[PDB]
Amino acid sequence: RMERVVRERMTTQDVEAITPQTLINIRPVVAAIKEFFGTSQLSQFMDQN
Amino acid sequence: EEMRHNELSTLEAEMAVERKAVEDQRDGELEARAQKLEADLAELEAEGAKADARRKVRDGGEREMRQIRDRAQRELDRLEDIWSTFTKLAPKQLIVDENLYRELVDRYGEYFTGAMGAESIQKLIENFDIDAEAESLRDVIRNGKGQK
Amino acid sequence: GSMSLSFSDPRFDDVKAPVDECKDKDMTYAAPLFVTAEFINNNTGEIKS
Amino acid sequence: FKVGDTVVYPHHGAALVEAIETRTIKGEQKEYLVLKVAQGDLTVRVPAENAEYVGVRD
DNA sequence: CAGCCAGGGACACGGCGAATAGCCATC
RNA sequence: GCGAGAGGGACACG
DNA sequence: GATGGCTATTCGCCGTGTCCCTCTCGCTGGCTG
């Protein structure tokens, strides 16, 4: 998803005037991590008694 | 269909004038083609050329004749489609090819009603006799047989 | 094909807070992730990291 | 441009050049000037032949 | 950037019922 | 004071 | 050659037990100062 976003915003941004820090949008990756660890069918609540 | 009945000859006669006019256009194109082929003839026979060269200019002119008369045939087919639709413009039927329908309505805006969408289904329901079709189905069940 | 972007050097920092502290304070026990980029240009030629 | 001389690379601005690298691409060793701006936090590497074309200047 | 707005495909089976597909018959 | 997901208990061997 | 008209094949639609306990999470994007 992040690669989709970065390649799409590459066109709009003018060349020789932008940086990878300005290209990479990290919201989708952290969102994917969060939605895996939370509310997923394998990140099960720990069964410790 | 009322208008349909009568126009069944007047509209066809005007349409037949269309057929004649477009066929005359076709044969005029073919005559121009034959004239340009005679051009090819004399030109190549004189213009420094090879035997097969003038053979092939003749062949190309023949091919041009062929494509002209073919286009004429295709537009004649299109005419036939218009007349087949209007003659067989039975109600409660589906007409594909939006371009076709536009042709009909601009040429035959009257003589029928056409629509598309839910409101078309509404109109079909309004102009639809329950008793007539019920009696028809009673006849079919009483007399028919099989899948029907 | 006028440019390209690449990644490398996946590095993990030390965890922000220890295990019991994270369990108590509703904090997710995570560590920051740092990845080095390389934004190569072709029309003019330069790589950005 | 020489090592240790502060240079202006637009649009970012001031930066400090670390060294000249001769890494090979297509079998040719290129004068890879490598330059760093603290604010941008970006390693700008360019051949010295086309340095003026990109616009880097003192 | 946030209040307040709003706008891209995976292991199931079994049975029932309708719409075709393919093939022999006749005008 | 709803939905999804996960785990779990109870359910004839003549 | 097309409508009838019979058998076969796809292809959708419908269904597939009851009761209870616990836990955790709940969609994404733009204007603008």
Q: Beta-carbon neighbour count of residue C15 at 10 Å? A: 13
Where are the alpha helices (H) located in chain B, listed in sequence order? 2-46, 51-87, 98-108, 118-126, 130-143
Residue A8 touches partner C, C-beta closer than 8 Å = no
**Contact criterion met (CB below 8 Å) for B17 and B125:** no
For B106, phi and psi rounded to 5 degrees? -70, -35
**Contact criterion met (CB below 8 Å) for A42 and A49:** no
**Contact criterion met (CB below 8 Å) for C43 and C2:** yes
| Cis geometry, peptide bond prior to residue B5 (ω within 30 degrees of 0) | no
For residues A9 and A25, give the distance between their C-alpha atoms in angstroms, rounded to a whole number. 10
- Residue B119 CA: distances (Å) to CA of B114, B116, B126: 11, 7, 10
Return the DSSP state at D57.
B
For residues B92 and B127, give the distance between their C-alpha atoms in angstroms, rounded to a whole number. 10
Return the DSSP state at D48.
S
For residues A11 and B18, give the distance between their C-alpha atoms in angstroms, rounded to a whole number. 55
A16 CB less than 7 Å from any atom of strand F: no
**Contact criterion met (CB below 8 Å) for B57 and B42:** no
In angstroms, what is the resolution? 3.4
Tokens of residue D38, six digits? 């603290």
Residue with tokens 């330059």: D35
Radius of gyration of chain A (CA): 17
Where are the alpha helices (H) located in D1-58, listed in sequence order? 51-54
Q: Which residues touch strand G (CB under 7 A)?
A: A 31, 34-35, 38-39, 45; B 145-148
Nucleotide nearest to A44 (CA to C1'): F6
For residues B148 and B141, give the distance between their C-alpha atoms in angstroms, rounded to a whole number. 9
**Contact criterion met (CB below 8 Å) for C29 and C17:** yes
For B97: left if phi > 0, alpha if psi spans -120 to 50, otherwise beta; the answer is left
